[PDB]
Design an enzyme around this catalytic site. Structure first.
Site, mmCIF file in Angstrom:
data_model
loop_
_atom_site.group_PDB
_atom_site.id
_atom_site.type_symbol
_atom_site.label_atom_id
_atom_site.label_comp_id
_atom_site.label_asym_id
_atom_site.label_seq_id
_atom_site.Cartn_x
_atom_site.Cartn_y
_atom_site.Cartn_z
ATOM 1 N N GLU A 162 0.753 -1.263 0.022
ATOM 2 C CA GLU A 162 -0.127 0.083 0.115
ATOM 3 C C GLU A 162 0.714 1.133 0.028
ATOM 4 O O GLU A 162 0.591 2.432 -0.637
ATOM 5 C CB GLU A 162 -0.874 0.053 1.409
ATOM 6 C CG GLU A 162 -2.064 -0.931 1.105
ATOM 7 C CD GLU A 162 -3.210 -0.666 0.111
ATOM 8 O OE1 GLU A 162 -3.026 0.405 -0.538
ATOM 9 O OE2 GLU A 162 -3.791 -1.697 -0.046
ATOM 10 N N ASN B 7 -8.168 9.504 -5.085
ATOM 11 C CA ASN B 7 -8.948 8.616 -5.863
ATOM 12 C C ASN B 7 -9.802 9.337 -6.908
ATOM 13 O O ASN B 7 -9.997 10.510 -6.631
ATOM 14 C CB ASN B 7 -9.743 7.709 -4.938
ATOM 15 C CG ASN B 7 -8.985 6.960 -3.951
ATOM 16 O OD1 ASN B 7 -9.262 7.084 -2.511
ATOM 17 N ND2 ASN B 7 -8.194 6.277 -4.199
ATOM 18 N N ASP C 16 -13.010 9.295 -7.305
ATOM 19 C CA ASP C 16 -14.329 10.051 -6.665
ATOM 20 C C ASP C 16 -14.092 11.411 -5.892
ATOM 21 O O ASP C 16 -14.943 11.908 -5.393
ATOM 22 C CB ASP C 16 -15.049 9.013 -5.863
ATOM 23 C CG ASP C 16 -14.255 8.455 -4.479
ATOM 24 O OD1 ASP C 16 -13.230 9.054 -4.375
ATOM 25 O OD2 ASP C 16 -14.922 7.737 -3.860
ATOM 26 N N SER D 141 -11.852 11.370 -2.935
ATOM 27 C CA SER D 141 -11.501 11.077 -1.901
ATOM 28 C C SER D 141 -9.945 10.718 -1.970
ATOM 29 O O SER D 141 -9.301 10.504 -2.862
ATOM 30 C CB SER D 141 -12.188 9.768 -1.324
ATOM 31 O OG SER D 141 -11.922 8.556 -2.064
ATOM 32 N N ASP E 135 -6.479 8.634 0.073
ATOM 33 C CA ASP E 135 -5.949 7.453 0.765
ATOM 34 C C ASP E 135 -4.674 7.925 1.685
ATOM 35 O O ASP E 135 -3.809 8.560 1.077
ATOM 36 C CB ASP E 135 -5.643 6.278 0.125
ATOM 37 C CG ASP E 135 -6.504 5.682 -0.485
ATOM 38 O OD1 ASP E 135 -7.892 5.809 -0.172
ATOM 39 O OD2 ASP E 135 -6.479 4.838 -1.385
ATOM 40 N N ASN F 265 -8.913 5.551 3.650
ATOM 41 C CA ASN F 265 -9.607 6.233 2.738
ATOM 42 C C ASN F 265 -10.556 7.228 3.482
ATOM 43 O O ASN F 265 -11.315 7.053 4.335
ATOM 44 C CB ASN F 265 -10.588 5.326 1.844
ATOM 45 C CG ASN F 265 -11.038 6.434 0.905
ATOM 46 O OD1 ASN F 265 -12.267 6.551 1.015
ATOM 47 N ND2 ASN F 265 -10.604 6.597 -0.155
#
Ligand SMILES: [Cl-]
Ligand SMILES: [Cl-]
Ligand SMILES: [Cl-]
Ligand SMILES: [Cl-]
Ligand SMILES: [Cl-]
Ligand SMILES: [Cl-]
Ligand SMILES: [Cl-]
Ligand SMILES: [Cl-]
Ligand code: NA
Length: 129
Positions: free
Chosen positions: A35, A46, A48, A50, A52, A59
């Site tokens: 990750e 991301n 959308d 959002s 991370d 998220n």
């Protein structure tokens, strides 16, 4: 901070992740490697809108507040910047809530695609634990 593999294994064990909800320590070290490459300061945006955050790429749509993800929740009750600290306590506490939510470690796309079903014990071999 960028952790070494055994240094992070020891810190995760101390914070109670080893066999947490049936997932052995090697699963958690493998997820952190793919990750974030063990870097507490990693961020990724991301499609959308959002973002991370941190060593386990948690998220902002569900788990933390970053002031820029309209209509999202903050189920961990923390600002997302708290997840970038060199002290992993906030990340670990929030991950324990995520893994308990019904889908297990499948919540982490890199764990499902790169760790699940592999020899995960390899990630802790040679470490003093
Ligand atoms: Cl490594
Ligand atoms: Cl293991
Ligand atoms: Cl927000
Ligand atoms: Cl912005
Ligand atoms: Cl909320
Ligand atoms: Cl905040
Ligand atoms: Cl720590
Ligand atoms: Cl499970
Ligand atoms: Na949020």
């Amino acid at each position: 901070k960028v952790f070494g593999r055994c240094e992070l294994a020891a810190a995760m064990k101390r914070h109670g992740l080893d066999n947490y909800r049936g997932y052995s320590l090697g699963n958690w070290v493998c997820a952190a490697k793919f990750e974030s490459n063990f870097n507490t300061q990693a961020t990724n945006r991301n499609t959308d809108g959002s973002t991370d955050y941190g060593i386990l790429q948690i998220n902002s749509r569900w788990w933390c507040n970053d002031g820029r993800t309209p209509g999202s929740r903050n189920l961990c009750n923390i600002p997302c910047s708290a997840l970038l600290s060199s002290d992993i306590t906030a990340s670990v506490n929030c991950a324990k809530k995520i893994v308990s939510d019904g889908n297990g470690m499948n919540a982490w796309v890199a764990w499902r695609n790169r760790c699940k079903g592999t020899d995960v014990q390899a990630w802790i071999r040679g470490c003093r634990l």
